[PDB]
Design an enzyme around this catalytic site. Structure first.
Site, PDB file in Angstrom:
ATOM      1  CE  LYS B  71      -3.712  -2.343   2.171  1.00 16.85           C
ATOM      2  NZ  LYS B  71      -4.769  -2.442   3.184  1.00 16.85           N
ATOM      3  CD  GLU B  93     -10.846   6.012   0.748  1.00 19.09           C
ATOM      4  OE1 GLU B  93     -11.685   6.736   0.176  1.00 19.09           O
ATOM      5  OE2 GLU B  93      -9.712   5.720   0.272  1.00 19.09           O
ATOM      6  CB  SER B 311       0.182 -13.874  -1.372  1.00 14.58           C
ATOM      7  OG  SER B 311       0.172 -14.835  -0.324  1.00 14.58           O
TER       8      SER B 311
END
Lengths: 331, 331
Positions: B71, B93, B311
């Site tokens: 992120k 947000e 992952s």
């Protein structure tokens, strides 16, 4: 050292000395270090914090590694050394299970049969890591004799080794063991300082004026200081919060200046770094950062180049800080 | 897109296009990527697993990053883009709080005033990340309107932006937003594939035959596939466990072969990688690894070069596997 372990330790020292002279070894050790211990960590320059002064502050980001990385460091080195010695099995003891999980991993990788002694009590309060070691194919031997804890699991592994060193290498977790262990260990941990040194030269064209690192076991200060012990024109500040081998070694080198930092100074620093650098330091780093902060703040003009070793569980002991603050009412 | 956001989105696209033509930008974006998102991740060759066959398997170690790294990837890119645009505040947000903590961090770093909308319910069930964002200097605005959750905090941030885009950049978390967002986002996530490509060429002197990656949102498959979409001689296997933008995009490129993997195959793989490579994969990686394993096992002789995207929460969903196994009695 019990006279029975002399043979094992000598053949180990002999092998270590050899592997240290083999660039082919150091080569493989580095590939593992990259691929499995996430090395090299970043060295990041903080500009917001030094803004307004002549200090150039750099943090050695060991904080971004995953937990146990630093343990993985010496086991990758030793697992490799054992393979060199033609060993086939590995013996290790564990408390929390980090070291054990590191030995299993290194072991699966180089295809060595691994058995890990662990105190019965720890085995109970440690399902996760125990499940991991097993998952990795290692064998976890619980120990109920004595206190049924680390010293026990440790005493037991040693007895095991002392009867199987011919085919099994004993994986030491601490840096505190018989010779040549502390060397091998200090050696498979020195990349922190080596990276820092090379990184700092590449970006600043010179070594740092001082290298601050919070000393106090598991701080891995020796890892950061090792490569600077003979860089006499570089200061080694060891920060103490508010004997252990960490100090033991550091005292003997004769080149570490110890200094103390106080909980408030720590929190000051902790809070400062979050706010200006966007980095949540661990309390151990916070003290080291506090001293750098004091050095800068004291003489805003002294043009100084500092490097602070960042410890690690930044978002693990983020909780005791939430407390310290909710407690002290600052919350 | 509501006609009111047209201006903001156009000036954004204009700025993006410019920054993409500035090597000085891409330069700074890379320094941040190194220093704050722990990049490049390692690309590690598994030899024990392929032993006995002609497959050469490589895992792209995104598993060693710290949570939220991916992120941090697009916010570092956007925070930088905002600074470029001369913006001074940032609006974001958050649900779990990862994205929020990423925006705060990026924000403190580039010195931008950050405000993060978050549903009241999430603020409650999320003290830690909320404490982090605040610690970092951001401002967390709880939202109680509507469901008092993400869609709400999201709808609210958007309303805020649509009245302040002149000085504030809206930090998008998902890749699913109005143009030019999905581009910018896909762009600040493509390094996974870029590193893989360069890494694979350096070690194998050629591109991979296929790149397997479990597709299914937050898998960041697009990140791994992006740089291979036009490497037509390279296969893109998307693995599905057992519409979402992830697929949406992948379908449109016309070059992803989807395949399915079954819980047992996953566990087979999961268990295999732990045992031979000493790597505890996450269940998402496990399926991707399962397919590679099937490709190898099917034709032991086809000389093939595969890359599997790893992952992440390997030791987070280590628990549901403990269950799956204790359940299924295999424990």
């Amino acid at each position: 050292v019990p006279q029975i372990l002399m043979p094992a330790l000598r053949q180990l020292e002999e092998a270590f000395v050899s592997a240290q002279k083999d660039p082919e070894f150091q080569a493989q050790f580095n590939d593992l270090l990259k691929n499995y211990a996430g090395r090299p960590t970043a060295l990041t320059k903080c500009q917001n914090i030094t803004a307004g002064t002549n200090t150039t502050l750099y943090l050695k980001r060991e904080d971004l590694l995953h937990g146990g990385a630093h343990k993985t460091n010496q086991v990758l080195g030793q697992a490799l050394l054992a393979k060199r010695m033609g060993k086939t099995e590995i013996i290790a003891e564990t408390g929390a299970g980090q070291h054990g999980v590191a030995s299993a991993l290194a072991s699966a990788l180089l295809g060595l049969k691994c058995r890990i002694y662990m105190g019965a009590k720890d085995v109970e309060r440690q399902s996760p890591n125990v499940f991991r070691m097993r998952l990795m194919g290692a064998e976890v031997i619980p120990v109920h004799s004595g206190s049924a804890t680390l010293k026990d699991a440790c005493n037991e592994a040693l007895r095991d080794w002392s009867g199987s060193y011919e085919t099994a290498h004993y994986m030491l977790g601490t840096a505190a063991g018989p010779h040549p262990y502390p060397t091998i260990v200090r050696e498979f941990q020195r990349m922190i300082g080596e990276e820092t040194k090379a990184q700092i030269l590449e970006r600043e064209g010179r070594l740092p004026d001082a290298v601050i690192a919070c000393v106090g076991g598991g701080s891995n200060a020796i890892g950061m200081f090792a490569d600077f012990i003979n860089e006499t024109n570089v200061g080694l500040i060891g920060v103490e919060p508010g004997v252990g081998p960490q100090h033991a070694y550091l005292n003997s080198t004769g080149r570490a200046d110890y200094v103390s930092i106080t909980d408030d100074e720590a929190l000051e620093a902790f809070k400062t770094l979050c706010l200006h650098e966007g980095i949540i330091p661990a309390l151990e780093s916070s003290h080291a950062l506090a001293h750098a902060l004091k050095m800068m703040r004291e003489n805003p003009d002294k043009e100084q180049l500092l490097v602070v070793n960042l410890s690690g569980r930044g978002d693990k002991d983020i909780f005791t800080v939430h407390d310290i603050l909710k407690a002290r009412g600052e919350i």
